Amino acid sequence: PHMERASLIQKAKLAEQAERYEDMAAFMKGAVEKGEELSCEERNLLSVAYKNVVGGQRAAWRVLSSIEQKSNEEGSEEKGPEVREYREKVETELQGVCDTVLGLLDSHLIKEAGDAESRVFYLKMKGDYYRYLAEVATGDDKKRIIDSARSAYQEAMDISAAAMPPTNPIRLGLALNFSVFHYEIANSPEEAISLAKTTFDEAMADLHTLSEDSYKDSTLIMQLLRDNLTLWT
């Protein structure tokens, strides 16, 4: 059972070259279920795979939801059922994918996480895929999901603050996604801007100290922080 794991990672890399991300996610899901820890490469293969899968489902959900808003505004009555049924089917597929990711995180990855870097990576994923569920959630389920995302995000913020430099791309991307959580989901634009401001400010103070190979990843996320701040202010 420890000779199949190498084949699953091999087929995940092949699926990535072939842009077959649903197969890639299935291959990475099987690799995680083997029980061994993931390296930095294997962590990204798992994250890249599922982000593309849920990313296309989110884009489809947003398209169908905007059409549903217009169809319940304009006066289209017979158009209503087709859009509602199809948007709900895409909504179910998206929720099913997030449950798979959150299932792998809580049952394998987050528990047996060796270093702080991986634990922040996995906890950031847990907050991300709870945030994706909150994007489509409605009532009783929604309010509990928003609390679960904040708990996962906050635990990663505390670990990264004590274990990572403010220029670390994982800490930056974590705060970037957390600020979006505050703005979009938690309805806290002042906390969203404050977190984005502080994240940019503290990373800006230490920009001259950055390492050579960290330049490209860190300055990219700082641009995203500035882009959202430009949009929110």
Partner: peptide
Amino acid sequence: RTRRETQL
């Protein structure tokens, strides 16, 4: 685009 940014 006109949308806010997030990343892996």
